[PDB]
Specification:
Keywords: Cytoplasm, Hydrolase, Magnesium, Metal-binding, Nucleotidyltransferase, Nucleus, Phosphoprotein, Terminal addition, Transferase. Interacts with PRP19 and DNTTIP1. Forms a ternary complex with DNTTIP2 and core histone. Released from this complex by PCNA. Interacts with TRERF1. Its cofactor is Mg(2+). One of its GO terms (biological process) is DNA metabolic process. This protein is α+β, with helices and mostly antiparallel strands and about 350 residues long. It contains 15 helices and ten strands. It has four domains: about 90 residues, Orthogonal Bundle (DNA polymerase, domain 1), CATH 1.10.150.110; about 60 residues, 5' to 3' exonuclease, C-terminal subdomain (DNA polymerase, domain 1, Orthogonal Bundle); about 140 residues, Beta Polymerase, domain 2, CATH 3.30.460.10; about 70 residues, Beta Polymerase, domain 3 (2-Layer Sandwich), CATH 3.30.210. A five-stranded mixed β-sheet has the order 2-4-7-6-5, with helices on both faces. A hairpin with a 4-residue loop joins strand 8 and strand 9. The longest helix is centred in the middle third of the chain and has 18 residues. It is globular and about 60 Å long. The structure holds magnesium ion and sodium ion. It binds one DNA strand of 4 nucleotides through helix 6, strand 6 and strand 7.
Length: about 350
DNA sequence: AAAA
């Protein structure tokens, strides 16, 4: 019997139900925009469970025994089986508010509030926003518009690997024992991504050395002329605090949101200049204390739905509190240690789910 | 105030 929890399902990139899940993902995104958290969650859970199926749904009978498929969701599935299209998802794709929100938030530095503001001002295109003489843009938005075409184009695996080399080369210059791991979608087996994320940790670095590494690495790139954008968020990590109770847990580790200049010569692909000879790439770096590296790796590998269900399962089924920094057992009244993701899964009483099986 |  298929579990209601993504952390008890294996979800690989061979999705046999993309016709259904692309429609459910659009409906979930619209409910997020319309601030309908409940309807958003119901569509996300339904989309997630269909992504785990090893076969395509071809009739309503095929949905028998599948959890997280309410009456509203089953009406949407029925409509797609009928003529290969979702009239509901088609109406969202043609909605002016939905189109504007997708288009405006595609800019780095533009979120829900700024997209809503521009829509209510009567803006509908990025050309009209950029050329407006009354609008004032944040430094993040200026970078978002300047490098827009590069940031909107997919980062592929040769580019992600080229970025990994740059990150490792810079990091070991200041901390030679540091462990650098690519996380996010690429760790889950994805061919593309909007950004490249890394977890950095050092077994021998001091509290101060750990704090200074992201500043040293970004100053080095600034000197080389590779730092196009940089925002460093200082750590608010607390060694002895209980893990988050929130549905969507916050990460308190030191991190930085960057835009790096990736020279074409560094990329070893099949297509190896054409234009400027470089590509702007969104990169995130996270630095964590050595003893929390398994919790941080688990949180940053994702997917977002896999993380939500992991934390929900820990709370509701095991009376445990899990977040990117720790695992606390409320019955035993102890923090649980882990040197690997496998040990976290074993503490939770879960069969180990490989990173490429976490595409929930 | 509003970047996973
Ligand atoms: Mg990612
Ligand atoms: Na955005």
């Amino acid at each position: 019997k298929i579990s209601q929890y993504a952390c008890q399902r294996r979800t690989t990139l061979n999705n046999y139900n993309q016709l259904f899940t692309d429609a459910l993902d659009i409906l979930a995104e619209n409910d997020e925009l319309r601030e309908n958290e409940g309807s958003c969650l119901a569509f996300m859970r339904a989309s997630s469970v269909l992504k785990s199926l090893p076969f395509p749904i071809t009739s309503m009978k095929d949905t028998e025994g599948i959890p997280c498929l309410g009456d509203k969701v089953k009406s949407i599935i029925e409509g797609i089986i009928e003529d290969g299209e979702s009239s509901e998802a088609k109406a969202v794709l043609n909605d002016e508010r939905y189109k504007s929100f997708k288009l405006f938030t595609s800019v780095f530095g533009v979120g829900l509030k700024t997209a809503e503001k521009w829509f209510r001002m009567g803006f509908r295109t990025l050309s009209k926003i950029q050329s407006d003489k009354s609008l004032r843009f944040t430094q993040m938005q200026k970078a978002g518009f300047l490098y827009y075409e590069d940031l909107v184009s997919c980062v592929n695996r040769p580019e992600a690997e080229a970025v990994s080399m740059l990150v490792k080369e810079a990091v070991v210059t200041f901390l030679p024992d540091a462990l650098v791991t690519m996380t996010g979608g690429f760790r889950r087996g994805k061919m593309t991504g909007h950004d490249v994320d890394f977890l950095i940790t050092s077994p021998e670095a001091t509290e101060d050395e750990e704090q200074q590494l992201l500043h040293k690495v970004t100053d080095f790139w600034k000197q080389q002329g590779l730092l196009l954008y940089c925002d460093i968020l200082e750590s608010t990590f607390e060694k002895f605090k209980q893990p988050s109770r929130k549905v969507d847990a916050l990460d308190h580790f030191q991190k930085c949101f960057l835009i790096l200049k990736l020279d074409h010569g560094r990329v070893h692909s099949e297509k190896s200049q054409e234009g400027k000879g470089w590509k702007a790439i969104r990169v995130d770096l996270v630095m964590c204390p050595y003893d929390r590296r398994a919790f941080a790796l688990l949180g940053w590998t994702g997917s977002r739905q896999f993380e939500r269900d992991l934390r929900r399962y820990a709370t509701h089924e095991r009376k445990m509190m899990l977040d990117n920094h720790a695992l606390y057992d409320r019955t035993k009244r102890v923090f649980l240690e882990a040197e690997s993701e496998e040990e976290i899964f074993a503490h939770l009483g879960l069969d180990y789910i490989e990173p490429w099986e976490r595409n929930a």
